[PDB]
């Protein structure tokens, strides 16, 4: 457009221009609407979709198949399963809830048993039988041993200049 070069999708804009502007924009010089020099009409501009990809795999040792997550993109222009963190390809949807190993995001995570994706389960549910005239006392006991590891130091390295 008259020396203005760019890429995107042109749509019929709704914002109203005063009769003396040539092109609109927004914060930090992002050209948002332009009038064409022939039909005088106003069209708004926005870039088409783009974004990263991720691969979910159970490990080469176990299986040789993967699933692909396209981040932050509507899978209408890329079983396809629509998440809130993008959209997933190669993983079926199950309506059961388990504890999962590979997190994806927005409460959705996938695992291997193939390559199913579900909503992570918070934990086992139970209701304590509360009452105002009863208590519960243990009768037996157990002795348990637990381990924990803490780092304290790393290697000492020196690098010269010359």
């Amino acid at each position: 457009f008259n020396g203005l070069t760019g890429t995107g999708v042109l749509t019929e804009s709704n914002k109203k221009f005063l009769p003396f502007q040539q092109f609109g924009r927004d914060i930090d010089d992002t050209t948002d609407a332009v009038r064409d020099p022939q039909t005088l009409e106003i069209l708004d501009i926005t870039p088409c979709s783009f974004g990263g990809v991720s691969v979910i795999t159970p490990g080469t040792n176990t299986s040789n198949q993967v699933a692909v997550l396209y981040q932050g993109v509507n899978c209408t222009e890329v079983n396809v399963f629509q998440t809130r963190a993008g959209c997933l390809i190669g993983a079926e949807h199950v309506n059961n809830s388990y504890e999962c190993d590979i997190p994806i995001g927005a409460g959705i995570c996938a695992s291997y048993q193939s390559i199913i994706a579900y909503t992570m389960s918070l934990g086992a549910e139970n209701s304590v039988a509360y009452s105002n005239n009863s208590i519960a006392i243990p009768i037996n006991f157990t002795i348990s041993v637990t381990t924990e590891i803490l780092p304290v130091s790393m290697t000492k390295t020196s690098v010269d200049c010359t």
Partner: protein, 55 residues
Amino acid sequence: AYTNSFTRGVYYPDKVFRSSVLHSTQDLFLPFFSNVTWFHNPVLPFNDGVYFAST
């Protein structure tokens, strides 16, 4: 006679459409609360621009 020009003399600096934004600009403006001179065919100076009101 002299008069105070409270908030008069603000124009559109450029031919760009903006909305819902605060924009900091630097240009030739009439200072706020400036001192305008009432007049009543005298030749007048034209320093770097003239704001010419009327009634």
